[PDB]
């Protein structure tokens with residue numbers, strides 16, 4: 001559903 | 014380290030619009046470029062939010078919920094700040110290479126959206142908002158709306174939000190005013206925070222219509238298209254509780 005946002009929150013910065 | 018100093022170090026880097034000034038202006042062209050810039054600002058806003066003390070302790074669904082409700086208040090508030098800092102005039106400083114001057118606001122249909130954003134910078138200027146007050150207020154805009162049935166980590170959110178409300182209080186006291194002037198300032202700044210709900214409702218009405226009308230050919234990057242697609246049904250179902258400091 002909100003693929004890009006979930007990815008940015010879950011990835012390591 | 015003080016909490017406001019931790020909010021200060023995570024302030025995003027300057028983003029340029031990549032606007033070719035050697036090609037003439039048009040409302041459609043400016044709106045398209047600003048949507049692209051907006052998507053890049055929202056990607057940077059995710060990285061910003063994850064570094065806010067307390068934010069990553071919320072349930073992942075709550076982190077997503079808060080960024081999806083507050084997107085436009087974050088962008089308008091940060092824009093209002095850049096505009097207030099870069100000019101003591103009626104300019105919208107979206108990016109250093111894309112400033113909405115007096116001539117650009119005469120472009121057809123430009124002013125409609127611009128007046129809502131000009132109100133934010135006008136208010137920060139009228140209230141002479143400080144850097145520290147601004148940082149506390151911007152974090153509080155991230156925490157300014159929740160679902161009508163609340164968050165998964167509602168109790169922890171309430172604790173985090175109260176902590177940043179106290180941080181705004183501490184920033185206000187630093188202006189070295191008396192107890193009565195500090196109470197007036199807290200009232201004024203929280204009144205501006207409340208008014209961002211109205212500013213954003215006006216920006217979203219226009220933005221949602223522009224996104225839905227495919228015949229306008231106004232492009233939105235993936236980040237903004239995904240937020241808008243998520244938000245339109247939430248507003249349609251009344252699924253939003255706008256937090257207020259005053260009634």
Ligand SMILES: C[C@H](NC(=O)C(C)(F)F)[C@H](Oc1ccc(C#N)cc1Br)c1cnc(C2CC2)nc1
Pocket residue numbers: 043044045047048050051054085088089092107108113123126127216219220221223224231237
């Ligand atoms: C999402 C929104 N799209 C719209 O409202 C629209 C026009 F497409 F419907 C977009 O909002 C922003 C974009 C970038 C930043 C930054 N930095 C901040 C914001 Br707030 C926008 C705002 N105003 C304009 C033009 C000037 C009238 N064009 C695009």
